[PDB]
Design a protein around this ligand. Structure first.
Ligand code: SF4
Length: 85
């Protein structure tokens, strides 16, 4: 299941960032941000990401923009950008 500190679709920042766990049914293709095809784009390959979170699982990891909380790796937000590294 999602962890207690999962970033909710209803989270005020998620609402600003257009985060969705369902990256597929997020503004991915709509935004079509360059670097990697939307299909491949997720938090999993976001620049603003943290596999450096207290209580990281595997499916649920940290975001740079969401410290403390946990994003789904296979989810996406508008502030994506490919990994620069
Ligand atoms: S900034 Fe990146 S890791 Fe954070 S929610 Fe957005 S896409 Fe995911």
């Amino acid at each position: 299941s999602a962890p207690a500190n999962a970033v909710a679709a209803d989270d005020a920042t998620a609402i600003a960032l257009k985060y969705n766990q369902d990256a597929t049914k997020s503004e991915r293709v709509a935004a079509a941000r360059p670097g990697l095809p939307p299909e491949e784009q997720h938090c999993a390959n976001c620049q603003f990401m943290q596999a450096d979170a207290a209580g990281a699982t595997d499916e649920w990891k940290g975001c740079q923009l969401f410290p403390g909380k946990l994003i789904n790796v296979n989810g996406w937000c508008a502030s994506w950008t490919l990994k620069a590294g």
